[PDB]
Amino acid sequence: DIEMTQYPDSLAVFLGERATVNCKSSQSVLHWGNDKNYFAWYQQKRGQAPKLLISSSSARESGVPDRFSGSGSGTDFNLTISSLQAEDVAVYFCQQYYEAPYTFGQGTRLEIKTVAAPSVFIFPPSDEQLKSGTASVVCLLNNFYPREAKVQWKVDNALQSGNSQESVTEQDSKDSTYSLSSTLTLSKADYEKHKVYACEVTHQGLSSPVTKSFNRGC
Amino acid sequence: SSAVRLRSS
Amino acid sequence: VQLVQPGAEVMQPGASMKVPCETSGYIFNDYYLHWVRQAPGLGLEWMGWIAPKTGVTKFAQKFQGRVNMTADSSVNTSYLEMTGLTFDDTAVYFCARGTYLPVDESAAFDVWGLGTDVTVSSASTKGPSVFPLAPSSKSGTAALGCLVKDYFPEPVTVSWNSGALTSGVHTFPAVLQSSGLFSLSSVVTVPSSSLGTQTYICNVNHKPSNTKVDKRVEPK
Ligand SMILES: *[C@@H]1O[C@H](CO)[C@@H](O)[C@H](O)[C@H]1NC(C)=O
Ligand SMILES: *[C@@H]1O[C@H](CO)[C@@H](O)[C@H](O)[C@H]1NC(C)=O
Ligand SMILES: *[C@@H]1O[C@H](CO)[C@@H](O)[C@H](O)[C@H]1NC(C)=O
Numbered sequence: 001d002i003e004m005t006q007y008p009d010s011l012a013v014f015l016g017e018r019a020t021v022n023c024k025s026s027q028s029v030l031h032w033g034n035d036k037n038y039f040a041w042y043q044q045k046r047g048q049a050p051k052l053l054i055s056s057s058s059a060r061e062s063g064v065p066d067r068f069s070g071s072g073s074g075t076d077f078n079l080t081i082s083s084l085q086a087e088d089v090a091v092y093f094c095q096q097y098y099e100a101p102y103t104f105g106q107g108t109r110l111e112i113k114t115v116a117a118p119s120v121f122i123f124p125p126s127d128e129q130l131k132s133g134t135a136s137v138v139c140l141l142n143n144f145y146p147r148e149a150k151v152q153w154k155v156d157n158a159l160q161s162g163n164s165q166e167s168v169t170e171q172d173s174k175d176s177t178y179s180l181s182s183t184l185t186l187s188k189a190d191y192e193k194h195k196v197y198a199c200e201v202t203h204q205g206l207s208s209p210v211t212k213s214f215n216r217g218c
Numbered sequence: 219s220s221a222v223r224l225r226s227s
Numbered sequence: 228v229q230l231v232q233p234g235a236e237v238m239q240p241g242a243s244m245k246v247p248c249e250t251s252g253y254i255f256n257d258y259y260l261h262w263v264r265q266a267p268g269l270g271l272e273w274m275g276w277i278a279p280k281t282g283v284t285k286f287a288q289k290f291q292g293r294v295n296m297t298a299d300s301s302v303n304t305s306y307l308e309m310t311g312l313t314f315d316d317t318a319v320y321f322c323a324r325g326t327y328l329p330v331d332e333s334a335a336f337d338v339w340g341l342g343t344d345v346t347v348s349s350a351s352t353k354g355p356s357v358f359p360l361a362p363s364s365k366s367g368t369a370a371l372g373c374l375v376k377d378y379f380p381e382p383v384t385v386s387w388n389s390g391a392l393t394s395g396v397h398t399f400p401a402v403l404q405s406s407g408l409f410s411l412s413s414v415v416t417v418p419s420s421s422l423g424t425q426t427y428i429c430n431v432n433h434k435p436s437n438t439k440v441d442k443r444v445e446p447k
Contacts (some may be wrong), residue, residue: 037221
């Protein structure tokens with residue numbers, strides 16, 4: 001199989017600036033017969049199908065704006081955006097269609113902006129939910145950049161592990177931040193054996209980690 | 219030998 | 228010129244699936260179709276192609292002996308069949324158009340289906356419980372929201388105040404719990420000053436169970 005690898009995994013660029021994605025193939029996709037590279041680039045936005053941008057290494061599809069261009073031959077290709085626009089935030093994929101199996105790599109492109117600290121909130125389980133035997137504790141990290149954050153749960157100052165799950169918004173269209181929701185799930189019986197419920201946050205925007213917490217009983 | 223890469227080859 | 232696919236299919240572990248791709252706006256027989264799948268938050272994986280005119284196929288080695296690709300030109304549709312489904316087959320299945328057969332030069336995939344979201348699960352259809360995330364007795368701006376728990380399948384939609392409140396709204400992607408049911412949160416940031424004043428309702432819609440819930444979120 002022809003293995004495709006993209007560099008980097010994740011690219012942050014300021015609006016109006018140049019962005020370049022690299023792809024390497026483990027074998028040449030240049031055909032001696034016509035001197036053509038059987039190499040494509042695709043754009044995929046969150047929740048949509050891939051869109052073909054570039055085929056034959058460098059031929060733009062109809063309607064792809066000319067800020068997009070492709071370069072390389074054989075095993076080494078770049079996709080370049082001369083000037084990043086907001087509509088260009090997406091995941092970009094390479095593909096070889098030189099021989100089956102017709103393999104892809106993977107590359108995430110976001111707007112770069114200044115570092116922003118998360119606003120942190122903690123939510124105890126509702127009375128409604130406790131009546132049904134489960135306790136969800138939610139921690140919210142609102143409007144931070146960059147995307148990397150660490151949430152740590154603690155219950156009477158004991159570090160929790162394996163009993164939480166989190167998810168992260170797409171980049172906000174108005175301020176280019178991310179938000180994050182973490183849920184800690186316990187049995188009501190387990191919830192009711194502890195006092196202190198704490199959400200601890202570590203982020204590049206914070207000078208030290210931020211903790212939010214409540215005592216069971218409100 | 220083909221001038222082009224052929225899907226069914 | 229397009230490829231039409233159904234939005235979603237839910238199958239059981241160990242069962243078979245059949246995902247269609249109906250062609251529009253061109254001659255069904257004249258192009259190769261490809262299947263490419265994408266597990267939640269991951270890459271694109273090429274599965275195989277079919278030349279619908281002749282039914283000749285080629286599959287990636289890892290799918291050999293559990294997939295088939297077939298074509299019925301009478302409905303302009305081509306089908307992906309796969310057996311022995313597992314959790315690892317949960318993914319979106321896209322069909323895409325490649326090579327023009329009369330010339331047969333290998334080509335990139337210019338036209339894609341929207342994809343069929345296939346969930347492998349033995350869970351039953353279930354509407355969500357909606358719990359309040361009450362604004363805390365501190366704060367500037369306050370956070371509040373809705374916890375939408377224990378539904379199956381995806382998706383649910385959330386709106387605040389019947390669509391009048393959109394500024395400072397964050398509806399998170401859902402997470403699959405070990406129960407096999409989904410959970411998500413929707414939060415908004417609001418002026419602290421408005422907490423005793425302004426009503427906040429999250430409007431939840433889970434189409435699969437025909438569940439609508441309006442939940443008022445007040446200070447506790
Ligand atoms: C692609 O981009 C890098 C800069 O990231 C450059 O130095 C490299 O030589 C370029 N290669 C091709 C294949 O166009
Ligand atoms: C199949 O496709 C062609 C042209 O796109 C058309 O003439 C034919 O009716 C289509 N539909 C059916 C139901 O065969
Ligand atoms: C795939 O379907 C075609 C048409 O029904 C059939 O002739 C073929 O043998 C099928 N199964 C496999 C694995 O090829």
